[PDB]
């Protein structure tokens, strides 16, 4: 509710915090499965696509020992029939990776597919209505705003640049993804403070998952747990312990 005087930075989680879980789980990711075949058929000749496929081919070789692993075989020739089979293998492999737990090869192709979806106006990133107005006010009040999500930074930029509220990239000072560390590790938050160029105690982290909130608290970061429609429930003790907010408007600077 009321932010300590020492906070100069607000760090924001995305899923379940600024954006509904339903958008991420039921729209953003399913889009990839629905579109990977068409995307590969359409853009196969693009240098970037050839590079993405090479990365997935290398990853497929590394995963060959796994039960259920889908190989991405060497081509038989270079005719449209050979291409059809190759594309089906890449498609099957992408779907298999997604069906299991998130390799760099998979994320790389996903980011390029989303670039087309968002840039062409096929999809918009959903934000809860209280987010943009509060953020604008926080910045007016001098707060810096950074994002921390397991979603790649490149994908995060697409979400803010094509939101249901228009292009809101200017509302963000910087982005962090798993390259700086995993969200349930306190060391990640110590590195985030270093990257931003502040102290851990200058940060207020808003997130919906308690395991992330507790990791951040262990790093001497201030935390508030955000409750949105569809979030995993909080235990009684958690509701008592953590400062809860159901809207960004509830934060007072
Ligand atoms: Mg979350
Ligand atoms: Mg430091
Ligand atoms: Mg302190």
CSV table of N, CA and C in Angstrom, one decimal, residues 16-91:
chain,number,residue,atom,x,y,z
A,16,UNK,N,0.1,-12.8,-14.3
A,16,UNK,CA,-0.6,-12.8,-13.1
A,16,UNK,C,-0.4,-11.5,-12.3
A,17,UNK,N,0.3,-10.6,-12.9
A,17,UNK,CA,0.6,-9.3,-12.2
A,17,UNK,C,0.1,-8.1,-13.0
A,18,UNK,N,0.7,-7.9,-14.2
A,18,UNK,CA,0.3,-6.9,-15.1
A,18,UNK,C,-0.7,-7.4,-16.2
A,19,UNK,N,-0.6,-8.7,-16.3
A,19,UNK,CA,-1.3,-9.4,-17.4
A,19,UNK,C,-2.0,-10.7,-16.9
A,20,UNK,N,-3.2,-10.9,-17.4
A,20,UNK,CA,-3.8,-12.2,-16.9
A,20,UNK,C,-3.2,-13.5,-17.3
A,21,UNK,N,-3.2,-14.4,-16.4
A,21,UNK,CA,-2.6,-15.7,-16.7
A,21,UNK,C,-3.3,-16.3,-17.9
A,22,UNK,N,-4.6,-16.1,-18.1
A,22,UNK,CA,-5.3,-16.6,-19.2
A,22,UNK,C,-4.8,-16.1,-20.6
A,23,UNK,N,-4.3,-14.8,-20.6
A,23,UNK,CA,-3.7,-14.4,-21.9
A,23,UNK,C,-2.4,-15.2,-22.2
A,24,UNK,N,-1.5,-15.3,-21.3
A,24,UNK,CA,-0.3,-16.0,-21.5
A,24,UNK,C,-0.5,-17.5,-21.8
A,25,UNK,N,-1.3,-18.2,-20.9
A,25,UNK,CA,-1.5,-19.6,-21.1
A,25,UNK,C,-2.4,-20.0,-22.2
A,26,UNK,N,-3.4,-19.2,-22.5
A,26,UNK,CA,-4.4,-19.6,-23.5
A,26,UNK,C,-4.4,-18.9,-24.8
A,27,UNK,N,-3.6,-17.8,-24.9
A,27,UNK,CA,-3.5,-17.1,-26.1
A,27,UNK,C,-2.0,-17.0,-26.7
A,28,UNK,N,-1.1,-16.4,-25.9
A,28,UNK,CA,0.3,-16.2,-26.3
A,28,UNK,C,1.0,-17.5,-26.6
A,29,UNK,N,1.0,-18.5,-25.8
A,29,UNK,CA,1.6,-19.8,-26.1
A,29,UNK,C,0.9,-20.7,-27.1
A,30,UNK,N,-0.4,-20.8,-27.0
A,30,UNK,CA,-1.1,-21.7,-28.0
A,30,UNK,C,-0.9,-21.1,-29.4
A,31,UNK,N,-0.7,-19.8,-29.5
A,31,UNK,CA,-0.5,-19.2,-30.8
A,31,UNK,C,0.6,-19.9,-31.6
A,32,UNK,N,1.7,-20.2,-30.8
A,32,UNK,CA,2.8,-20.8,-31.4
A,32,UNK,C,2.5,-22.2,-32.0
A,33,UNK,N,1.8,-23.0,-31.3
A,33,UNK,CA,1.5,-24.3,-31.8
A,33,UNK,C,0.6,-24.2,-33.1
A,34,UNK,N,-0.4,-23.3,-33.1
A,34,UNK,CA,-1.3,-23.1,-34.2
A,34,UNK,C,-0.6,-22.6,-35.4
A,35,UNK,N,0.5,-21.9,-35.2
A,35,UNK,CA,1.2,-21.2,-36.4
A,35,UNK,C,2.5,-21.6,-36.8
A,36,UNK,N,3.2,-22.5,-36.1
A,36,UNK,CA,4.5,-22.9,-36.5
A,36,UNK,C,4.6,-23.5,-37.8
A,37,UNK,N,3.7,-24.3,-38.3
A,37,UNK,CA,3.8,-24.9,-39.6
A,37,UNK,C,3.7,-23.9,-40.7
A,38,UNK,N,2.7,-23.0,-40.6
A,38,UNK,CA,2.5,-22.0,-41.6
A,38,UNK,C,3.7,-21.0,-41.7
A,39,UNK,N,4.2,-20.6,-40.5
A,39,UNK,CA,5.3,-19.7,-40.3
A,39,UNK,C,6.6,-20.3,-41.0
A,40,UNK,N,6.9,-21.6,-40.7
A,40,UNK,CA,8.0,-22.2,-41.3
A,40,UNK,C,7.9,-22.4,-42.8
A,41,UNK,N,6.6,-22.7,-43.3
A,41,UNK,CA,6.4,-22.9,-44.7
A,41,UNK,C,6.6,-21.5,-45.4
A,42,UNK,N,6.1,-20.5,-44.8
A,42,UNK,CA,6.2,-19.1,-45.4
A,42,UNK,C,7.6,-18.5,-45.4
A,43,UNK,N,8.3,-18.7,-44.3
A,43,UNK,CA,9.6,-18.0,-44.1
A,43,UNK,C,10.9,-18.9,-44.1
A,44,UNK,N,10.7,-20.1,-44.6
A,44,UNK,CA,11.8,-21.0,-44.6
A,44,UNK,C,13.1,-20.5,-45.2
A,45,UNK,N,13.0,-19.8,-46.4
A,45,UNK,CA,14.2,-19.2,-47.0
A,45,UNK,C,14.8,-18.0,-46.3
A,46,UNK,N,14.1,-17.4,-45.4
A,46,UNK,CA,14.7,-16.3,-44.6
A,46,UNK,C,16.0,-16.7,-43.9
A,47,UNK,N,17.0,-15.9,-43.9
A,47,UNK,CA,18.3,-16.3,-43.2
A,47,UNK,C,18.0,-16.5,-41.7
A,48,UNK,N,17.2,-15.6,-41.1
A,48,UNK,CA,16.9,-15.7,-39.7
A,48,UNK,C,16.2,-17.1,-39.4
A,49,UNK,N,15.3,-17.5,-40.3
A,49,UNK,CA,14.6,-18.8,-40.1
A,49,UNK,C,15.5,-19.9,-40.2
A,50,UNK,N,16.4,-19.9,-41.2
A,50,UNK,CA,17.4,-21.0,-41.4
A,50,UNK,C,18.3,-21.0,-40.1
A,51,UNK,N,18.6,-19.9,-39.5
A,51,UNK,CA,19.4,-19.9,-38.3
A,51,UNK,C,18.6,-20.5,-37.1
A,52,UNK,N,17.3,-20.1,-37.0
A,52,UNK,CA,16.5,-20.6,-35.9
A,52,UNK,C,16.4,-22.2,-36.1
A,53,UNK,N,16.2,-22.7,-37.3
A,53,UNK,CA,16.0,-24.1,-37.5
A,53,UNK,C,17.3,-24.8,-37.2
A,54,UNK,N,18.5,-24.2,-37.5
A,54,UNK,CA,19.8,-24.8,-37.2
A,54,UNK,C,19.9,-24.9,-35.7
A,55,UNK,N,19.4,-23.9,-35.0
A,55,UNK,CA,19.5,-24.0,-33.5
A,55,UNK,C,18.7,-25.2,-33.0
A,56,UNK,N,17.4,-25.3,-33.5
A,56,UNK,CA,16.6,-26.4,-33.1
A,56,UNK,C,17.1,-27.7,-33.5
A,57,UNK,N,17.8,-27.8,-34.7
A,57,UNK,CA,18.4,-29.0,-35.1
A,57,UNK,C,19.5,-29.5,-34.1
A,58,UNK,N,20.3,-28.5,-33.7
A,58,UNK,CA,21.4,-28.8,-32.8
A,58,UNK,C,20.8,-29.3,-31.4
A,59,UNK,N,19.7,-28.6,-31.0
A,59,UNK,CA,19.0,-28.9,-29.8
A,59,UNK,C,18.4,-30.3,-29.9
A,60,UNK,N,17.9,-30.7,-31.0
A,60,UNK,CA,17.3,-32.0,-31.2
A,60,UNK,C,18.3,-33.1,-31.1
A,61,UNK,N,19.6,-32.8,-31.6
A,61,UNK,CA,20.6,-33.8,-31.5
A,61,UNK,C,21.0,-34.0,-30.0
A,62,UNK,N,21.0,-32.9,-29.2
A,62,UNK,CA,21.4,-33.0,-27.8
A,62,UNK,C,20.3,-33.7,-27.0
A,63,UNK,N,19.1,-33.7,-27.5
A,63,UNK,CA,17.9,-34.3,-26.8
A,63,UNK,C,17.6,-35.7,-27.3
A,64,UNK,N,18.4,-36.2,-28.3
A,64,UNK,CA,18.1,-37.5,-28.9
A,64,UNK,C,18.0,-38.7,-28.0
A,65,UNK,N,18.6,-38.6,-26.8
A,65,UNK,CA,18.6,-39.7,-25.8
A,65,UNK,C,17.3,-39.7,-25.0
A,66,UNK,N,16.5,-38.7,-25.1
A,66,UNK,CA,15.3,-38.6,-24.3
A,66,UNK,C,14.2,-39.5,-24.8
A,67,UNK,N,13.4,-40.2,-23.9
A,67,UNK,CA,12.3,-41.0,-24.4
A,67,UNK,C,11.3,-40.0,-25.0
A,68,UNK,N,10.8,-40.2,-26.2
A,68,UNK,CA,9.9,-39.4,-26.8
A,68,UNK,C,10.5,-38.2,-27.6
A,69,UNK,N,11.8,-38.1,-27.6
A,69,UNK,CA,12.4,-37.0,-28.3
A,69,UNK,C,12.1,-37.1,-29.8
A,70,UNK,N,11.9,-36.0,-30.4
A,70,UNK,CA,11.5,-35.9,-31.8
A,70,UNK,C,12.8,-35.4,-32.6
A,71,UNK,N,13.3,-36.3,-33.5
A,71,UNK,CA,14.5,-35.8,-34.2
A,71,UNK,C,14.2,-34.8,-35.3
A,72,UNK,N,15.2,-34.1,-35.7
A,72,UNK,CA,15.1,-33.2,-36.8
A,72,UNK,C,16.2,-33.7,-37.8
A,73,UNK,N,15.9,-34.7,-38.6
A,73,UNK,CA,16.7,-35.4,-39.5
A,73,UNK,C,17.4,-34.5,-40.6
A,74,UNK,N,18.4,-35.0,-41.2
A,74,UNK,CA,19.1,-34.3,-42.2
A,74,UNK,C,18.2,-34.4,-43.4
A,75,UNK,N,18.2,-33.5,-44.3
A,75,UNK,CA,17.3,-33.6,-45.5
A,75,UNK,C,17.7,-34.7,-46.4
A,76,UNK,N,16.7,-35.2,-47.1
A,76,UNK,CA,16.9,-36.3,-48.1
A,76,UNK,C,17.3,-35.8,-49.4
A,77,UNK,N,16.8,-34.6,-49.7
A,77,UNK,CA,17.1,-33.9,-51.0
A,77,UNK,C,16.7,-32.5,-50.8
A,78,UNK,N,16.5,-31.7,-51.8
A,78,UNK,CA,16.1,-30.3,-51.6
A,78,UNK,C,14.8,-30.0,-52.4
A,79,UNK,N,14.0,-31.0,-52.6
A,79,UNK,CA,12.7,-30.8,-53.3
A,79,UNK,C,11.6,-30.4,-52.3
A,80,UNK,N,10.5,-29.9,-52.9
A,80,UNK,CA,9.4,-29.5,-52.0
A,80,UNK,C,8.8,-30.6,-51.1
A,81,UNK,N,9.0,-31.9,-51.5
A,81,UNK,CA,8.6,-33.0,-50.8
A,81,UNK,C,9.6,-33.2,-49.6
A,82,UNK,N,10.9,-33.1,-49.8
A,82,UNK,CA,11.8,-33.1,-48.7
A,82,UNK,C,11.6,-32.0,-47.8
A,83,UNK,N,11.2,-30.8,-48.3
A,83,UNK,CA,10.9,-29.7,-47.4
A,83,UNK,C,9.7,-30.0,-46.5
A,84,UNK,N,8.7,-30.5,-47.1
A,84,UNK,CA,7.5,-30.8,-46.4
A,84,UNK,C,7.8,-31.7,-45.2
A,85,UNK,N,8.6,-32.8,-45.4
A,85,UNK,CA,9.0,-33.7,-44.3
A,85,UNK,C,9.8,-32.9,-43.3
A,86,UNK,N,10.8,-32.1,-43.7
A,86,UNK,CA,11.6,-31.4,-42.8
A,86,UNK,C,10.8,-30.4,-41.9
A,87,UNK,N,9.9,-29.7,-42.5
A,87,UNK,CA,9.0,-28.8,-41.8
A,87,UNK,C,8.2,-29.6,-40.8
A,88,UNK,N,7.7,-30.7,-41.1
A,88,UNK,CA,6.9,-31.5,-40.2
A,88,UNK,C,7.7,-31.9,-39.0
A,89,UNK,N,9.0,-32.2,-39.2
A,89,UNK,CA,9.9,-32.7,-38.1
A,89,UNK,C,10.1,-31.5,-37.2
A,90,UNK,N,10.3,-30.3,-37.8
A,90,UNK,CA,10.6,-29.1,-36.9
A,90,UNK,C,9.3,-28.8,-36.1
A,91,UNK,N,8.2,-28.9,-36.8
A,91,UNK,CA,6.9,-28.7,-36.1
A,91,UNK,C,6.7,-29.7,-35.0
